[PDB]
C-alpha cells in the first residue's frame, strides 16, 4: 500500500483541538481582565481583584491550561492572579500569548494541514 498500513490521525488532533480551544478561552478572559486592569494601584488591585473572576464554572479551563504550562508552580501563579492582578496577569498573559502562538504553530502543523488534506482530493489509491 504505502509504508505498511494506513495510519490515520489518532488522538493528536484531540489533544491540540482541546488545548487550543482551552488556550483561546483563557486568552480571551485574561486579555479582558488585563485590559480592565490597565495597570491598577495597590488599593485598586484590592478593589478590582479576581474574587469570582476566572472562577465560578469555567475556572477548570484556565486552571488546567495554567497547570499545563506551570504544572509545578500552578498554585503560586493562581495565587498571584487572586492577589496581584496588575502584577501577575500582564506577565502570565504574555507567557500565555507567546505560548498561544507556539500552540497555533502546532495547530498549523496538525489541525490546519489535516483540514487541507481531508477537504482536498485524497484520490482513490
Amino acid at each position: 500500500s504505502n509504508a505498511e498500513h494506513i495510519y490515520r490521525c489518532e488522538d493528536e488532533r484531540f489533544e491540540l483541538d482541546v488545548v487550543l480551544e482551552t488556550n483561546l478561552a483563557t486568552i480571551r478572559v485574561l486579555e479582558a481582565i488585563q485590559k480592565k486592569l490597565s495597570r491598577l494601584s495597590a488599593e485598586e488591585q484590592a478593589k478590582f481583584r479576581l474574587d469570582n473572576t476566572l472562577g465560578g464554572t469555567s475556572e477548570v479551563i484556565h486552571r488546567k491550561a495554567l497547570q499545563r504550562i506551570y504544572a509545578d508552580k500552578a498554585a503560586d501563579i493562581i495565587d498571584g492572579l487572586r492577589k496581584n492582578p496588575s502584577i501577575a496577569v500582564p506577565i502570565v498573559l504574555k507567557r500565555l500569548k507567546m505560548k498561544e502562538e507556539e500552540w497555533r504553530e502546532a495547530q498549523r502543523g496538525f489541525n490546519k494541514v489535516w483540514r487541507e488534506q481531508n477537504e482536498k482530493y485524497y484520490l482513490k489509491s
Partner: peptide, 27 residues
C-alpha cells in the same frame, strides 16, 4: 525534529523567572 514541536510544559527557568518577577515587580 518535526515541523512543529509539542511543548506544553514550561521549563523551570521560565517558571521560576515568573515567580521572581511576580514577588518583586521592580519596574
Amino acid at each position: 525534529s518535526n515541523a512543529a514541536q509539542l511543548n506544553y510544559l514550561l521549563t523551570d527557568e521560565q517558571i521560576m523567572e515568573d515567580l521572581r518577577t511576580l514577588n518583586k515587580l521592580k519596574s
